[PDB]
Amino acid sequence: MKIISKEFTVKTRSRFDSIDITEQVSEAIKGINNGIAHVIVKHTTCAIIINEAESGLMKDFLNWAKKLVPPDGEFEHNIIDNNGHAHVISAIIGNSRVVPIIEGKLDLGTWQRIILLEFDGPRTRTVLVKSMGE
Amino acid sequence: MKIISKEFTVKTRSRFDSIDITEQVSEAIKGINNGIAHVIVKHTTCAIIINEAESGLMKDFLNWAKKLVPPDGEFEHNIIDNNGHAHVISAIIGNSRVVPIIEGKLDLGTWQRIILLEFDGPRTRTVLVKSMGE
Amino acid sequence: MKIISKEFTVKTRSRFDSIDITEQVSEAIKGINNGIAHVIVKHTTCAIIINEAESGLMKDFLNWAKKLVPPDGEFEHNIIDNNGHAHVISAIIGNSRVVPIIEGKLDLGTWQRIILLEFDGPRTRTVLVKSMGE
Ligand SMILES: [Zn+2]
Ligand SMILES: [Zn+2]
Ligand SMILES: [Zn+2]
């Protein structure tokens, strides 16, 4: 079949941040008509989720992430760097998500958006979109 | 190679519900002999996991989801709709899971079943099974 | 295209354990030059994450998993077997992760390693690496 590999960067504006990257991903899949887009970050302290980018919810993801794994929590990693919480929550959520491609477009539900969740910003994060199909 | 795309629906019976959808997924992969099945929901308030569908555990997934992200919790999203908890826990778990296909069948471990977890039911949920391989 | 399917085993040394399996996965993808590696376990009580294998963090993943879903917690599943916590946390994290392959090598970020997280050891765990691409 066919394999497309394209990367783009986004600048996170705070320690905790959430960015809707759907538009950038739709550009990155060009070349594939029907298949699968793997939205991947080669980072260990930020994650990718597919959900609703409503204003309040964009805050909720971060605030609940903080509730589940408090940045002020106890982390053996923090002996070296103070972002153990970012590593832990990011590992649980995952560093990738799949989005089907159909008719050359992202096949998303009514309320689905591709979102990058940052837990150790501000930073320039790189997103790799590796698509496969025909 | 080959790309199969098939959808099926399941009716959730409660706000919190868990449904073993393995049989429906085994039908949806027909056409692919060796490859990968991406079990995807284009929903933002329900998720997909691959685990054991034992009776008690089917309750545990829901009860622990509730413990981690209480529906009665504080959500800025709830200003618009009262399902912020469903959005949050679903984003963390993920809206898809991969299952390998071999010999035309789902390659599952002894205790593995494909399970749909509902956090904002009752609703008719749609599952997309996008398979790729030969 | 091409489909490679290779399995390897790792012995977990404790109830809770974390093992860097990156090297074994790099061997298992041989045959694929450009594509996607799906690192999968057909188990229901251990999970796969892609993150930093720093010494302290390797402990943090396990300790925070324990904090989120206490093994001593209430599980209806424990009427049959006392590993309900392992099932729950493993379902949330997921039983697979994707790693892109480029130039015949795992395309990993500076701090990324493929890690197996065990919550019901000691056991011999099997990892399936199903790769697709050219
Ligand atoms: Zn760190
Ligand atoms: Zn909502
Ligand atoms: Zn069990």
For residue B132, list its beta bridge partners.
Answer: B3, B36
Across the interface, whether the CB atoms of C112 and A87 are under 8 A apart is answered: no
The data reach a resolution, in angstroms, of 2.0
Q: Do B51 and C78 touch (CB under 8 A)?
A: no
Rounded CA-CA distance B13/C110 in Å is 46
Q: How far is CA C58 from CA A39, C20, C64, in A?
A: 25, 9, 11
DSSP, residue by residue, C70-128: -TTS--GGGGT-S-HHHHHHHHHH-SEEEEEEETTEE---TT-EEEEEESS-S-EEEEE
C82 labeled part of a ligand binding site: no
φ, ψ at A77 (rounded to 5°): -65, -30
CA distance A110 to A52: 9
How far from A116 is each of A36, A105, A121, C90, C106, CA to CA, in Å? 18, 20, 12, 23, 22
3-state secondary structure at position A62:
helix
DSSP-assigned beta bridge partners for residue A100: A36
For residues A39, B42, B28 and A98, what is the CA-based torsion angle, rounded to 10 degrees?
Answer: 10
Neighbours of C85 (CB within 10 A): 25
Q: In this structure, what token pair is assigned to residue C84?
A: 């309900």
Tokens of B69: 């992200």
Backbone φ and ψ for C12, nearest 5 degrees, come out as -85, 145
C-alpha–C-alpha distance, residues B7 and A128, integer Å: 28
Q: Kindly report the CATH class assigned to C2-134.
A: mainly beta
| Residue in A with minimal Cα distance to C38 | A38
Closest-CA distance, A119 to chain C, in angstroms, reads 14
Radius of gyration of chain C (CA): 15
CA distances from B92 to A40, A53, A113, C24 (A): 15, 14, 14, 28
Q: Which residues of B40-59 are buried (b: 16+ CB within 10 A; e: fewer)?
A: bbbbbbbbbbbbbbbebbbe
Measured CA to CA, the distance from residue C61 to residue A24 in angstroms comes to 31
Cα C95 from Cα B113, distance rounded (Å)? 12
Q: Residue A114 in contact with residue A50, Cβ under 8 Å?
A: yes
User: Do residues B94 and A49 touch, judged by C-beta distance below 8 A?
Assistant: yes
Paired tokens of C54: 């720093």
CA of C39 to the centre of ligand 1 (A): 23
Asked if B128 has any chain C CB less than 8 Å from its own CB, the reply is no
- This entry's atomic model was obtained through X-ray
How far is the C-alpha of B32 from the C-alpha of B28, rounded, in Å?
10
Domain spans in chain B, listed from the N-terminal domain onward: 2-134
How far is C-alpha A32 from the geometric centre of its chain's CA atoms? 21
- How far apart are alpha carbons A113 and A24 in whole angstroms? 11
Radius of gyration of chain B (CA): 15
In contact, B114 and B25? CB cutoff 8 Å: yes
Q: In what order do the strands lie in the sheet with C2-11?
A: C2-11, C124-133, C35-41, C96-102, C105-106
Q: How far apart are CA A89 and CA B25, in angstroms?
A: 30
| Short-list C87, A111, A109, C130, CA closest to B37 | C130
For residue C84, which ligand has an atom nearest its CA? 3
Helix-helix angle C84-93:B55-68, to 10 degrees: 60
**The two three-digit tokens of residue B23, written as one number:** 């049989």
- Angstrom CA distances, C6 to A58, A71, C31, C105, stand at 40, 38, 11, 16
